[PDB]
Amino acid sequence: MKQLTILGSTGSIGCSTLDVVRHNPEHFRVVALVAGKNVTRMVEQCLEFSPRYAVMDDEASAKLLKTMLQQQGSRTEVLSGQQAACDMAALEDVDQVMAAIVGAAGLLPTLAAIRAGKTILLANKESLVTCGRLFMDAVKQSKAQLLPVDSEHNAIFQSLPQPIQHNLGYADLEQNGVVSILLTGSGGPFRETPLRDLATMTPDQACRHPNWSMGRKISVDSATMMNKGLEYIEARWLFNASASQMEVLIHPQSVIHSMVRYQDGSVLAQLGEPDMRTPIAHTMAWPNRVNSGVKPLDFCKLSALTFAAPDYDRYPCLKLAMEAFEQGQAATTALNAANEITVAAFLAQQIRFTDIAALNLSVLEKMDMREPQCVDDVLSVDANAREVARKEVMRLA
Amino acid sequence: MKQLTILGSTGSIGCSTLDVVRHNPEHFRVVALVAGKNVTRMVEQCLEFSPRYAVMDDEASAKLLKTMLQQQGSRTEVLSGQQAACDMAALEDVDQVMAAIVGAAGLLPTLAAIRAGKTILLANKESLVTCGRLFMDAVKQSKAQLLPVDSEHNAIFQSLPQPIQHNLGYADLEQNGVVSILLTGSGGPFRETPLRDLATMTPDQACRHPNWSMGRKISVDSATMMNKGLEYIEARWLFNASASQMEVLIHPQSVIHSMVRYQDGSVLAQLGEPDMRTPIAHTMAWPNRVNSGVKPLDFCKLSALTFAAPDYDRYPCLKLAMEAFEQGQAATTALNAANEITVAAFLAQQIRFTDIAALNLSVLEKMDMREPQCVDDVLSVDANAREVARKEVMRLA
Ligand SMILES: O=CN(O)CCCP(=O)(O)O
Numbered sequence: 158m159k160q161l162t163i164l165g166s167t168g169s170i171g172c173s174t175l176d177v178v179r180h181n182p183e184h185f186r187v188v189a190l191v192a193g194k195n196v197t198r199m200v201e202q203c204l205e206f207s208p209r210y211a212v213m214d215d216e217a218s219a220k221l222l223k224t225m226l227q228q229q230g231s232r233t234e235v236l237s238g239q240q241a242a243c244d245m246a247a248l249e250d251v252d253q254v255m256a257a258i259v260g261a262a263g264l265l266p267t268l269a270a271i272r273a274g275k276t277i278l279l280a281n282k283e284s285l286v287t288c289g290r291l292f293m294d295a296v297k298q299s300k301a302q303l304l305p306v307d308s309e310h311n312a313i314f315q316s317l318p319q320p321i322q323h324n325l326g327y328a329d330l331e332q333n334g335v336v337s338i339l340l341t342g343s344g345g346p347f348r349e350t351p352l353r354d355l356a357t358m359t360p361d362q363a364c365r366h367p368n369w370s371m372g373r374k375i376s377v378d379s380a381t382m383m384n385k386g387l388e389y390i391e392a393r394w395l396f397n398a399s400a401s402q403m404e405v406l407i408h409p410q411s412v413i414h415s416m417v418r419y420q421d422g423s424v425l426a427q428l429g430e431p432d433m434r435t436p437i438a439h440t441m442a443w444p445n446r447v448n449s450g451v452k453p454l455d456f457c458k459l460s461a462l463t464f465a466a467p468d469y470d471r472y473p474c475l476k477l478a479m480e481a482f483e484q485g486q487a488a489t490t491a492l493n494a495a496n497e498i499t500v501a502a503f504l505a506q507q508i509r510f511t512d513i514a515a516l517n518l519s520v521l522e523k524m525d526m527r528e529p530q531c532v533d534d535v536l537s538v539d540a541n542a543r544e545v546a547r548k549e550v551m552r553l554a
Numbered sequence: 555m556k557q558l559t560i561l562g563s564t565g566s567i568g569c570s571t572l573d574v575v576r577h578n579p580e581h582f583r584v585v586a587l588v589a590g591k592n593v594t595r596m597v598e599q600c601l602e603f604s605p606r607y608a609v610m611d612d613e614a615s616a617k618l619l620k621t622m623l624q625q626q627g628s629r630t631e632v633l634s635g636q637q638a639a640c641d642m643a644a645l646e647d648v649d650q651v652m653a654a655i656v657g658a659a660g661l662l663p664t665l666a667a668i669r670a671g672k673t674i675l676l677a678n679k680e681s682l683v684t685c686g687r688l689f690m691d692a693v694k695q696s697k698a699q700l701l702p703v704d705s706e707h708n709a710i711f712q713s714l715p716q717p718i719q720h721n722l723g724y725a726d727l728e729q730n731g732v733v734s735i736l737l738t739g740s741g742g743p744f745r746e747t748p749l750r751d752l753a754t755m756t757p758d759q760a761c762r763h764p765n766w767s768m769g770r771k772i773s774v775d776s777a778t779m780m781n782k783g784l785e786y787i788e789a790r791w792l793f794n795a796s797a798s799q800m801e802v803l804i805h806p807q808s809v810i811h812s813m814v815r816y817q818d819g820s821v822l823a824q825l826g827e828p829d830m831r832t833p834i835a836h837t838m839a840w841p842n843r844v845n846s847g848v849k850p851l852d853f854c855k856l857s858a859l860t861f862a863a864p865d866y867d868r869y870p871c872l873k874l875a876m877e878a879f880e881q882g883q884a885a886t887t888a889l890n891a892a893n894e895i896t897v898a899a900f901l902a903q904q905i906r907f908t909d910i911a912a913l914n915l916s917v918l919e920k921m922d923m924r925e926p927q928c929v930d931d932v933l934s935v936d937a938n939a940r941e942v943a944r945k946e947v948m949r950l951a
Pocket residue numbers: 307308309341342343344345369370375378379382384385
């Protein structure tokens with residue numbers, strides 16, 4: 158009977174984790190729900206699971222949730238602010254923490270759940286893209302169990318050997334028989350578009366396109382593969398890998414979520430439906446399993462499976478993210494940062510598609526950075542990179 | 555520093571296991587070599603690895619091997635017959651036993667390795683296709699460690715959870731989160747041949763055809779899928795699965811060696827080159843890994859991957875085998891028996907290709923069998939099945 162705390166219990170991955178707790182009530186219990194402003198879905202969930210706690214980002218919002226919970230009689234106690242969240246993450250009697258609150262918002266609560274040595278359902282990129290050095294040391298220190306929920310990492314983890322699974326981060330790949338890790342990705346919708354044509358690409362040609370893909374910003378990240386590359390950054394930290402023990406493969410159909418290469422030639426892989434309840438269920442049930450309400454992969458009703466290597470000319474955002482890792486957590490925190498600006502510039506139509514790569518590039522250049530050292534060094538490197546970025550979209554007016 | 559005994563040190567899988575020991579001398583050592591008649595390759599091997607024992611099938615052979623070893627000064631001691639082999643399999647100081655001696659020749663030494671409770675690199679179909687009830691009960695009794703080397707079971711084993719790997723045969727699938735096991739297979743060379751055309755198939759059309767396939771008799775078992783079907787029989791026994799927890803899938807390219815379905819939708823799979831040194835190295839190094847000298851799978855230089863369900867009208871030898879499992883070890887020992895006859899009749903041109911399916915069927919019918927009870931009951935059911943078969947090829951003269 159595991160007990161959890163969800164950080165971002167109102168977003169996509171939050172509800173999926175709640176749909177997972179719902180169909181498996183015999184093993185899971187909510188002790189705390191943490192959200193941002195959706196007081197609306199939060200009451201519903203507090204009403205359904207009845208966490209001992211509910212936390213919202215501001216008092217304005219809590220004083221209202223506190224109110225609708227009042228209406229229903231929900232004994233659920235309401236708190237507010239960031240501290241409240243970190244306190245739910247470090248909660249004494251809590252077993253796992255679905256670190257699904259994204260952005261910089263989540264760096265501290267994910268960290269507080271880490272510091273407390275808890276099984277961590279790591280459901281946010283930024284935690285390792287910006288605070289990777291810190292976060293992994295915080296794990297060594299307290300022996301917190303990282304369990305990645307991201308489709309790719311979930312698959313790479315499931316495909317790894319056991320003694321590397323219990324020591325996530327300090328488990329040496331190569332000594333335990335791993336030749337390399339196979340990070341796979343669709344390759345974006347402009348994978349076969351002639352190179353001189355990526356410049357004339359519109360936002361409508363890249364935005365939530367089929368077979369495991371549906372999100373405004375990440376479509377441009379799937380399209381530029383700034384997404385894969387950023388998962389290269391987390392992979393490297395998460396699994397303790399060196400650029401030689403890494404591989405990025407274009408797998409258009411996204412059936413194979415990602416693989417792991419071994420010494421004797423065996424390649425271990427994971428596949429299933431794109432549904433996030435699969436990796437949310439795996440991580441929660443581990444080292445056992447539970448149902449999630451997801452479809453058994455019909456290998457018949459399926460597309461043919463192909464692969465390819467990325468063309469670093471067609472996907473510059475990936476070579477950037479690879480070199481960015483080689484420069485330090487300041488270069489990747491600022492690369493993640495400037496990228497959100499630029500992608501955004503592209504979606505509003507301020508710069509060409511091919512300008513996201515070139516500009517994220519520039520900010521990374523025009524900025525002599527120095528490795529961070531806490532959840533604040535990282536915040537700052539982000540606000541300086543955003544600024545070199547917001548200011549860069551500008552010269553193109 | 556593991557020490558082994560190889561049963562059938564001269565055949566294909568033997569040499570591959572000898573090539574695995576060669577490139578990893580730091581972890582493996584031969585204590586005994588067991589062959590059949592090839593005194594010729596046996597000397598060379600005895601000369602190279604210097605096992606404390608070499609065993610041949612007859613004194614005639616051994617008095618000659620004993621002689622050429624004399625020539626070179628090989629201290630290796632030479633023995634003969636079956637007892638010798640069983641003794642090499644039960645050897646006190648031996649850790650693993652590559653049970654690669656195939657046929658009925660190997661049921662007892664494989665058994666002797668089992669009884670003595672040793673890590674068993676299982677490399678012969680018959681062991682479970684005929685003596686499945688007995689072999690698994692002998693495993694329970696002495697807690698021997700089966701480690702399948704067959705491309706498919708190796709893939710299905712690698713893909714299972716840990717607590718099912720260490721208790722091979724008794725670890726319940728479903729209770730450990732396994733939904734079913736995906737037994738995959740090319741589909742044979744007549745997978746797309748119109749149905750009324752299988753009857754006019756010749757032996758040159760089905761014999762050692764590319765992409766993980768090279769053998770006179772199994773090519774016909776690939777073509778009829780009597781091979782897949784027979785692997786459905788070992789699987790059921792090996793992994794402790796019910797016909798519901800089993801799935802047979804056609805995968806033409808044979809990249810994916812086989813998979814394992816889980817409750818949360820996750821499908822774990824193994825892929826790699828068709829080389830046998832991969833599963834031979836995995837089983838030998840287990841729970842660790844060693845190199846084997848095989849090629850890192852180039853996902854680039856690869857065909858598109860497709861899947862399909864077998865058409866039980868196209869592959870009758872598969873339904874036969876599935877229904878055969880449901881009748882007892884007498885129906886499967888006799889099905890494996892009659893199949894070697896018929897296939898063989900087909901290879902010699904005594905019956906049509908489509909006749910293998912119908913005759914194996916018949917023998918199974920025309921023969922009210924009764925479940926075996928030792929390595930003798932199985933031999934017998936084999937001899938009476940061959941006869942109902944040799945005699946059946948006959949009515950078509
Ligand atoms: O968790 C899901 N993804 O990472 C999918 C994003 C699309 P991509 O694999 O082409 O980057």
